[PDB]
Amino acid sequence: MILIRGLTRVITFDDQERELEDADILIDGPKIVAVGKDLSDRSVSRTIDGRGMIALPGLINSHQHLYEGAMRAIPQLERVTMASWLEGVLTRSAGWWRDGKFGPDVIREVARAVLLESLLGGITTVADQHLFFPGATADSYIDATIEAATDLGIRFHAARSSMTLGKSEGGFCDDLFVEPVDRVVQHCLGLIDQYHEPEPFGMVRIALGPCGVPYDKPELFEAFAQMAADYDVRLHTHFYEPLDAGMSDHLYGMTPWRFLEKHGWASDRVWLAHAVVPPREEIPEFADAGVAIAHLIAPDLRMGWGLAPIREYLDAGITVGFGTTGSASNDGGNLLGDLRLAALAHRPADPNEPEKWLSARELLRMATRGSAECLGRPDLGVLEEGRAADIACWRLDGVDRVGVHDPAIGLIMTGLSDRASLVVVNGQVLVENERPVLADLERIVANTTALIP
Amino acid sequence: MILIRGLTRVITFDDQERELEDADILIDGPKIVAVGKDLSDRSVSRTIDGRGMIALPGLINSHQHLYEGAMRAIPQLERVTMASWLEGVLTRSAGWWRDGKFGPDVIREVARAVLLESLLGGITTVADQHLFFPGATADSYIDATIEAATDLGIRFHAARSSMTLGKSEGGFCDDLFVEPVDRVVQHCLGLIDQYHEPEPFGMVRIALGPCGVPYDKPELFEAFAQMAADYDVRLHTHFYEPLDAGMSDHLYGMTPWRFLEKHGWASDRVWLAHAVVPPREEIPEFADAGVAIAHLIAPDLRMGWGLAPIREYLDAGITVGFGTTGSASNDGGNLLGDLRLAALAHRPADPNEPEKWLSARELLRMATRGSAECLGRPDLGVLEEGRAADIACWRLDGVDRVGVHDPAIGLIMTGLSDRASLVVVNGQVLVENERPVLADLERIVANTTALIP
Ligand SMILES: [Zn+2]
Ligand SMILES: [Zn+2]
């Protein structure tokens, strides 16, 4: 067993919202044995000094696009609206691929860098949505991301994505960038069979993740609804980005939500990215259907889209998680940092009603238990006996956090660095003293840097 | 001389916005001798390896309230409007003071911690506006902040503040903080005598800094205007916070700007904090007067105030700098991190006009040359021969910055940490390898922590 002893603060996000001061966490293999004061070192082979740290459940990034790690801080994409951005991302990936610079071997190393950054930011589970499948067959991009995740020991969900609707039939995505529906469906069946670990504490899971209503055929949504039921997997897509409702109205005469409902996606199998601009009248329907929503504050601001109605979702009892999206519209993978953006940016929408503003604890819950719920993981996101030993800890004793009265608020509101001190995934210590203990950091940086087009 | 050799990127903010790749900076005493490729090491006693770093002028925080370092992450102040915030801050400061827990000795150590954090975040100059003068005579609070700054070697401007308008004599300030105008003027003259270093590369400067139009007598503004011209010092106050216009209309029957103009503050000696909600028709007047504005995105969002019209200011040719304000409304001193907040949060105000969005380079200029201009420092904020050797460098070769195409944009848009690698102030190396060279970090944390009420 591993004992983390004397943590200054432990935030459990359990059903009573318990927190503890000067307390311990005991781990046995993949699971937490106990969380409490003065735990027995009875059968402990290693004790870790937690004094001066705050411990949370590992952060869970419920929406990534890992391959975009190769597209950070491109000047031509710094200040662009969505149409220009998407064109720029699609054309660069296709161009680099055509030139032999962007195959699965490159994506493997880009994924490795972004996932290692994720671990260093206290993120223990990442859900990636990968849509890039150029050419005549679906190449081993998903396999590559899974290989990187497995090598690092980070918990991983792969939501296989696509664009199946071309401009010729109402999609805002060129035919060149379009895949046949049957090819997508066939590929997903194989991925589930090869990789999906449905058991508690499973380290790799597959989800079905169309890019969205403006990008994919209704037939794909229906195929995936059937596949999800048959194989007991989850469903993910983008939802209510600003131009979406215009597209669905024009093509189908209905809202994006009504479209999802018609095609089998109004269910508790589903988590939805962004959800920036739904009609208010649909919010109770999201709640009744049991869909979950991932708040992605950074891209919502970066694209000029604005503020998702997160308070309204919480009021309605809808599950709200958190994510970063990909590094071409963030442009980092720093989930903890992005929580600060949300804590501050929502406030001016309700200048005279601060009770509506999202609190630090609400945001930390979104990034842990909320994201776990988005991914369908009752085994994650909570520090309590029987849950996965996925733990992230930050030091509280730096000069940049002097004067902090509440350490949980301090995690969001103070600091020069979001680097986690100690990170455990599946009971394995992966980061200590802000440095990877198993991954070869310097080698990974060098190798991936050499491969960036 | 000191040579920093082989910097990967140098951003000068000189008159032609020059940048350099694989270049050097040569320093002699307090000044930059040269910036360019393959500089001679003929007169050099120390060479520092700059490979893998980006170098900027040191960041300049043009608006702080250092004493608020002791008031971070207080649950009762997490989500509050300004009225509640001000009451909570004033009540705590006065209460702690009355109980002997908040004298200049405590403020010295709080300042030391926040200023060390500042250095670690690449900030080489701070302008503090100390807002706490309990009782009749003003204690050595300013002296305490200056002592901390001088001990650390950070360049420092102290804007002497006040609340000269009593809440009784029709005002908005607790009478316990109300000093006679002549007492304030006298303290300022003494501070100038004792501390002001008007020569180029001066390390301590005094500014004259009323809290604001709702807080100070017109007589103080006029006295300060006279002093500014005669001593060649600068003038600083808060400007166009929400509700200020109503307060000014009630007290004086004119706008906050009209008030400043009437009392001598419509001049190029002035920099103004926040400037969130001016009447648009006054903006050309600000420009004609030559006043400068410090953008403070974090408190503007934290208080629910919203987005200052920064693009409008830039369009009008108004000098724009940047600051963090105090740690009771931030709640950190991380200027670089706050730039990212501004980069993103301004965008949804102009969803269809990305050319209006603030660029990374515009923001980095605000935090360097713009802030230098706010403070009246033509010797700072630019990496060029003859300017002060105030330099901040960040590493570009971490795993969290893999895939970055433009390092300047990357500094704003990526990363787990805003910690600077190498920091030089007045030609003195103060941070290397992210660690203080001279300051005892652990002792400072322990000592200051012990004194937080
Ligand atoms: Zn996405
Ligand atoms: Zn202020």
Q: Return the H-helix or E-strand segment holding B110.
A: helix B104-120
DSSP A181-193: HHHHHHHHHHHHH
Torsion of CA A409, A412, A418, A420, to 10 degrees: 40
Q: Do A113 and B75 touch (CB under 8 A)?
A: no
Q: What's the rounded Cα separation, in Å, for the pair A302 and A345?
A: 12
For residue B69, the chain A residue with the least C-alpha distance is: A403
Residue type, B412: I
CB B61 within 8 A of CB B335: yes
Comparing alpha-carbon positions, the chain A residue that sits nearest to B122 is A416
| Residue B59 C-alpha, separation from nearest chain A C-alpha, in angstroms | 14
Beta bridge partners of A23: A7
CB within 8 Å: A81 and B452? no
Q: How many CA atoms lie within 13 A of A109 on its CB side?
A: 21
DSSP for B281-306?
Answer: GGHHHHHHHT-EEEE-HHHHHHTT--
DSSP B28-68: ETTEEEEEETT---TT-SEEEE-TTEEEEEPEEEEEE-GGG
Say which of A306, A330, A344 has its CB closest to residue B341.
A344
How far CA A163 is from CA of A64, A98, A168, A212, A272, in Å, comes to 17, 18, 13, 8, 17
Residue B235 burial (C-beta neighbours within 10 Å; 0-12, 13-18, 19+) = buried
What amino acid is encoded at B276 in this protein?
Answer: V
Give dist(CA B402, CA B221) in Å, integer: 51
In degrees and rounded to multiples of 5, residue B26 shows phi and psi of: -110, 130
- A238 carries a ligand binding annotation: yes
Q: Which two tokens stand for residue A440?
A: 């070869």
Q: Which of A120, A334, A413 lies closest to B331 in CB terms? A: A413
What is the DSSP secondary-structure string of A55-120? EEEPEEEEEE-GGGGGGBT-GGGSS--HHHHHHHHHHHHHHHHHTTSSSHHHHHHHHHHHHHHHHH
Experimental technique, in short, is X-ray
Q: Which residues contact A194 (CB under 8 A, 6 or more apart)?
A: none
**Contact indicator for A350, B304 with CB cutoff of 8 Å:** yes
- Residue B249: is it exposed, middle or buried by C-beta count within 10 angstroms (0-12/13-18/19+)? middle
- Starting at the earlier edge strand, list the strands of the sheet with A204-208: A59-64, A123-130, A155-160, A204-208, A234-239, A270-274, A292-295, A319-322
Beta pairing partners, B119 = none
CA B191 to CA B196: how far, in whole Å? 7
The values of phi and psi at residue A239, to 5°, are -155, 125
**Which numbered ligand comes closest to the C-alpha of B302?**
2
**Chain A touched by B79 (CB under 8 Å):** yes
Strands B2-11, B19-28: pairing kind: antiparallel
- Answer yes or no: are the C-beta atoms of A13 and A365 closer than 8 Å: yes
Q: Are B125 and B389 in contact (CB under 8 A)?
A: no
Resolution (angstroms) stands at: 1.4
Nearest to B417 among A302, A355, A417 (CB): A417
Nearest to A155 by CA among A289, A61, A294, A264: A61
User: If contacts are CB pairs under 8 Å, which of residues 137-196 in chain B contact chain A?
Assistant: none
Residues with beta carbon < 5 A to ion ligand 2?
B 325
For residue A330, list chain B residues with Cβ-Cβ distance below 8 A: 413-414
Q: How far is CA B417 from CA A55, A213, A333, B323, in A?
A: 19, 36, 12, 19
- Out of A332, A414, A448, whose CB is closest to B331? A414
Q: Which two tokens stand for residue A128?
A: 């990636």
- What CA–CA distance (Å, rounded) separates B61 from B123? 7
Cis peptide before B28 (omega within 30 of 0): no
Measured CA to CA in angstroms, residue A31 lies from A2, A26, A403 at distances of: 10, 9, 35
Query: 3-state SS of chain A: helix, strand, coil percent to 5?
Result: 40, 20, 40
Nearest CA-CA partner of B162 in B208, B204, B123:
B208
Under 8 Å between Cβ of B348 and A305: yes
User: In which residue are the tokens 């001049």 written?
Assistant: B267
Q: Within 13 Å, how many C-alpha atoms sit on residue B324's CB side?
A: 34
Distance (Å) from the alpha carbon of A224 to chain B's nearest alpha carbon? 33
Q: Which ligand is nearest to the CA of A128?
A: 1
- Domains in chain A, please, with CATH? 1-57+382-436 (2.30.40.10), 58-381 (3.20.20.140)
CA distances from B365 to A140, B11, B35 (A): 44, 10, 18
Confirm whether residue A130 is marked as ligand binding: no
3-state DSSP assignment of residue A362: helix
**Exposure on the CB side of residue A398, measured as CA atoms within 13 A:** 28
Whole-number Å distance, alpha carbon B323 to ligand 2 midpoint, is: 9
A156: distance to nearest CA of chain B, Å?
Answer: 19
Cα distance from B76 to chain A (closest Cα, Å)?
10
What spatial distance separates the first Cα and last Cα of chain B, rounded to whole Å?
45
Q: What's the CA gap between B75 and A413, in Å, rounded? A: 11
Q: DSSP characters for B127-171?
A: EE------SSS--THHHHHHHHHHHHT-EEEEEE----S-STTTS
Q: Cα B431 to the chain's mean position, in Å?
A: 20
Residue A64 one-letter amino acid: Q
Residue B407, Cα to own-chain centre: how many angstroms?
24
Q: Which of A359, A343, A341, A347 is closest to B305 using CA atoms?
A: A347
**Phi, psi angle pair for A385, to nearest 5°:** -50, 130
First to last CA, chain A: 44
A450 contact B CB<8A? no
- Tokens read off for A417: 């660095």
